[PDB]
Amino acid sequence: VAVFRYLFWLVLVVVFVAGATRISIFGLGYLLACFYLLLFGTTLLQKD
Amino acid sequence: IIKCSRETEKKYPQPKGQKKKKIVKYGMGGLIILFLIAIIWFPLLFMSLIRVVGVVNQPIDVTVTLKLGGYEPLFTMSAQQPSIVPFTPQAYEEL
Amino acid sequence: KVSPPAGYGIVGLYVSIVLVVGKFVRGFFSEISHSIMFEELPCVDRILKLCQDIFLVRETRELELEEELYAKLIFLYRSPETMIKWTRERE
Amino acid sequence: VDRILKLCQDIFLVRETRELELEEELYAKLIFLYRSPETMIKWTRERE
Amino acid sequence: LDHATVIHSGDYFLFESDAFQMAYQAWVTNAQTVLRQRRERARQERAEQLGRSHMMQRVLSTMQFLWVLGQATVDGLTRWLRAFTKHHRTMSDVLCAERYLLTQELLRVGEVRRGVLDQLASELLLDRRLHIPELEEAERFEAQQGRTLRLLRAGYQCVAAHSELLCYFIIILNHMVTASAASLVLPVLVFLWAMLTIPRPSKRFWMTAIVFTEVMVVTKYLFQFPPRILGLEKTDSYIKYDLVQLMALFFHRSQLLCYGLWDRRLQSFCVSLAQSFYQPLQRFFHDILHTKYRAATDVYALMFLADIVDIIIIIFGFWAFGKHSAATDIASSLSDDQVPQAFLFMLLVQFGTMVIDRALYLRKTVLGKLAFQVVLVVAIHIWMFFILPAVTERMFSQNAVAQLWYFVKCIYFALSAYQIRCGYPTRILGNFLTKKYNHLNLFLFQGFRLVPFLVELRAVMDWVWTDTTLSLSNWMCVEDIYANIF
Numbered sequence: 001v002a003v004f005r006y007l008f009w010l011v012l013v014v015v016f017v018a019g020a021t022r023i024s025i026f027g028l029g030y031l032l033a034c035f036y037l038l039l040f041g042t043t044l045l046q047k048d
Numbered sequence: 049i050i051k052c053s054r055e056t057e058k059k060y061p062q063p064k065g066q067k068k069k070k071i072v073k074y075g076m077g078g079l080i081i082l083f084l085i086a087i088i089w090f091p092l093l094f095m096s097l098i099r100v101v102g103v104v105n106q107p108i109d110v111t112v113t114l115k116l117g118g119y120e121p122l123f124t125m126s127a128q129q130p131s132i133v134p135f136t137p138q139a140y141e142e143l
Numbered sequence: 144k145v146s147p148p149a150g151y152g153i154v155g156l157y158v159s160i161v162l163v164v165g166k167f168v169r170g171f172f173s174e175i176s177h178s179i180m181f182e183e184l185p186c187v188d189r190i191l192k193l194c195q196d197i198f199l200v201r202e203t204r205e206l207e208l209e210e211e212l213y214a215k216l217i218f219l220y221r222s223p224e225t226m227i228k229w230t231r232e233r234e
Numbered sequence: 235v236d237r238i239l240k241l242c243q244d245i246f247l248v249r250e251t252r253e254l255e256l257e258e259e260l261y262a263k264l265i266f267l268y269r270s271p272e273t274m275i276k277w278t279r280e281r282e
Numbered sequence: 283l284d285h286a287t288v289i290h291s292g293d294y295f296l297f298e299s300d301a302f303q304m305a306y307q308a309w310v311t312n313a314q315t316v317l318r319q320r321r322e323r324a325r326q327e328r329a330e331q332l333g334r335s336h337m338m339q340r341v342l343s344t345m346q347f348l349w350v351l352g353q354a355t356v357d358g359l360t361r362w363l364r365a366f367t368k369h370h371r372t373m374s375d376v377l378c379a380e381r382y383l384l385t386q387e388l389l390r391v392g393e394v395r396r397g398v399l400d401q402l403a404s405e406l407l408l409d410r411r412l413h414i415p416e417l418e419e420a421e422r423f424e425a426q427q428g429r430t431l432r433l434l435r436a437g438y439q440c441v442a443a444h445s446e447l448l449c450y451f452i453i454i455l456n457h458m459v460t461a462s463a464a465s466l467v468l469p470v471l472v473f474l475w476a477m478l479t480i481p482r483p484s485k486r487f488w489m490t491a492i493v494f495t496e497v498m499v500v501t502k503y504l505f506q507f508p509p510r511i512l513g514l515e516k517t518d519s520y521i522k523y524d525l526v527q528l529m530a531l532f533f534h535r536s537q538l539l540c541y542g543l544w545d546r547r548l549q550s551f552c553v554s555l556a557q558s559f560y561q562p563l564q565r566f567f568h569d570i571l572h573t574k575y576r577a578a579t580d581v582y583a584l585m586f587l588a589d590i591v592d593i594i595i596i597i598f599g600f601w602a603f604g605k606h607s608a609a610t611d612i613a614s615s616l617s618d619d620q621v622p623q624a625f626l627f628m629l630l631v632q633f634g635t636m637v638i639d640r641a642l643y644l645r646k647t648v649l650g651k652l653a654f655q656v657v658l659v660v661a662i663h664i665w666m667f668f669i670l671p672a673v674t675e676r677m678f679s680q681n682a683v684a685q686l687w688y689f690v691k692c693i694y695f696a697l698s699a700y701q702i703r704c705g706y707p708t709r710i711l712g713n714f715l716t717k718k719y720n721h722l723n724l725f726l727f728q729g730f731r732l733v734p735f736l737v738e739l740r741a742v743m744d745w746v747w748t749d750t751t752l753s754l755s756n757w758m759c760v761e762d763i764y765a766n767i768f
């Protein structure tokens with residue numbers, strides 16, 4: 001059960017760090033997308 | 049002492065509800081604080097600002113002697129007032 | 144540069160002055176809270192009269208009254224209960 | 235000396251609450267408590 | 283009117299009233315007796331709910347003693363953690379109960395909020411009602427086991443409890459270790475905005491700070507990829523923990539949300555009124571900020587002790603300025619005088635600080651509070667935080683001790699502001715930290731009580747600033763009375 005929700009946070013954070021660990025335009029795109037989802041993350045999970 | 053207190057209260061009884069008077073606390077507290085703070089920083093302030101002051105001493109005479117063996121000073125010269133030139137700031141800069 | 148030959152072991156000066164400060168400050172109160180059993184009397188009046196009475200018998204130079212009144216005053220001191228028995232103010 | 239604590243902080247209490255007679259009242263009580271050792275020991279005997 | 287009449291008028295008959303303990307014993311007695319006590323305890327409670335050979339024996343017992351003592355230490359620390367857990371639990375358990383009501387909503391899709399509440403007058407800390415099996419077996423099991431998992435859970439609830447402390451930690455550390463223009467300007471403003479209103483200090487501000495962080499990091503990214511040098515942004519480590527600060531802040535929003543918190547003449551007069559509702563209304567916000575009755579617990583003694591510790595920190599930072607960062611003999615101090623004006627200015631300022639803090643404590647007037655915050659911010663910013671501070675050879679090499687002093691003052695200032703939020707100095711009671719009265723507490727207080735000069739300063743200040751009938755003799759005697767009493 002901890003895996004489910006806490007891993008949801010984990011996956012979002014880890015994908016963010018994965019984007020930022022190496023220097024790339026692709027990474028910056030991933031980080032910006034991460035913030036975009038991040039702000040609505042509670043809502044996105046809440047929504048269908 | 050105790051009779052003195054009784055006598056004073058008999059002829060000088062403070063009215064109830066005054067509680068205290070502000071000015072006298074100003075006075076006593078101020079004197080106490082000034083005395084203690086002054087003593088606390090007196091050595092500190094003295095060494096900070098006043099603290100022995102270096103006075104320049106500049107040789108008023110220089111004597112040089114060249115002597116061989118133990119026979120006789122072959123040379124001896126002493127210069128005191130006009131031949132002792134103090135450094136000017138420009139000369140110090142050159143040095 | 145040269146200075147007059149004051150300013151030696153100044154930290155000494157500091158430490159001894161501050162400990163002197165400690166001496167005075169503790170002096171004002173060290174155990175004075177112990178000296179709290181003598182200032183509560185409502186009236187030491189009778190003690191006055193008897194002490195000048197011992198002085199009186201002193202000039203009048205009578206034999207037993209002297210040591211008698213000295214012992215009484217000493218007993219008055221011994222018991223606080225006695226310092227307060229009749230010293231309660233006249234009603 | 236527990237009750238002595240409570241009363242001494244009580245004199246402090248009335249100090250901030252700044253009531254007139256209670257102050258000198260409680261100072262006189264504490265002073266009387268000091269006067270008699272018999273009184274220092276009357277109720278200070280430990281709770282049975 | 284008898285000011286001193288009561289001193290001698292008193293009657294008498296009416297006057298009369300109507301964990302580590304095992305470590306203690308083992309240091310005192312043979313620890314073998316201590317373990318015999320521990321297991322016989324185990325025996326008693328378990329009943330309640332329902333010499334060469336001797337030489338090897340003592341040594342084996344010693345090994346067991348070490349294991350048992352370590353276990354005891356962890357249990358005691360855990361107890362302290364547990365104490366933290368109860369205050370956090372207040373929130374945790376109320377949330378669990380409401381969650382169960384939600385569970386009922388899932389099983390029964392209907393709508394009545396009050397009815398589900400009825401299964402659980404409208405406001406109570408305690409809500410004793412029906413109880414659902416899963417919850418009880420769950421806590422009973424969690425309670426039953428623990429060797430180090432207790433620590434793990436304790437970490438979980440403590441971290442949830444802290445809520446905002448880490449952001450402070452990160453902000454201070456990042457600027458102190460690296461201080462670019464924004465990295466140094468942003469903290470003072472964030473503290474001031476943060477220490478304003480208890481319900482919601484910053485309506486939208488946290489986001490402004492965080493958005494600044496993403497843009498600045500992006501700037502760093504392009505920076506790796508001229509006039510650019512002019513800006514106070516320099517080549518360095520790619521990152522240290524900014525991502526962690528950002529994630530922590532996001533968690534902060536999530537916790538606030540989970541708990542639940544937000545985040546002709548006609549036209550001319552209308553425009554003037556709108557301008558009033560923006561800026562003069564904001565002034566009124568400050569007024570309500572400064573209005574009476576916000577309630578929080580008051581702990582003056584922690585501030586005073588923190589302050590004295592701050593002086594301790596400052597004084598420690600003296601020899602380091604010299605060529606001797608090791609607290610060497612006094613002779614070097616006598617023979618160096620390496621620009622000592624700063625020491626005197628700082629010490630004078632901190633004493634004035636203590637004086638004013640006590641003055642504010644006794645009179646609780648707002649101007650002192652504001653004076654405190656403004657003076658501290660201007661002093662830190664003007665005195666330090668540019669190239670001139672590096673006048674001493676403390677650019678970054680040993681440039682942490684002054685920073686150590688910096689954060690300590692920062693935490694003190696923040697807690698001081700929290701105290702401003704509570705106000706209420708008039709209502710007082712002994713410091714619960716002091717009121718825990720521990721032998722360690724007793725040692726610390728007595729050590730505080732053995733330092734020179736304390737007595738006169740405390741007595742004089744309180745005497746002037748305490749506003750009742752009082753002679754110097756009576757009050758000073760009372761401090762003596764406190765000394766014997768404690």
Ligand SMILES: CCCCCCCCCCCCCCCCC[C@@H](O)O[C@H](CO[C@H](O)CCCCCCCCCCCCCCC)COP(=O)(O)OCC[N+](C)(C)C
Nearest residue numbers: 049052053056057060061062072079083170171285753755
């Ligand atoms: C650069 C140098 C600076 C000075 C350095 C030296 C400092 C010397 C300090 C000397 C202090 C003297 C204090 C005198 C206080 C007088 C207080 C008096 O005015 O009030 C009375 C209370 O004082 C008592 O009479 C004195 C009681 C003393 C009891 C304890 C005795 C201590 C043991 C013997 C003295 C030992 C001294 C040791 C150190 C010298 C009654 O007050 P009250 O009527 O309500 O109010 C009326 C309005 N007043 C106050 C303005 C008049």
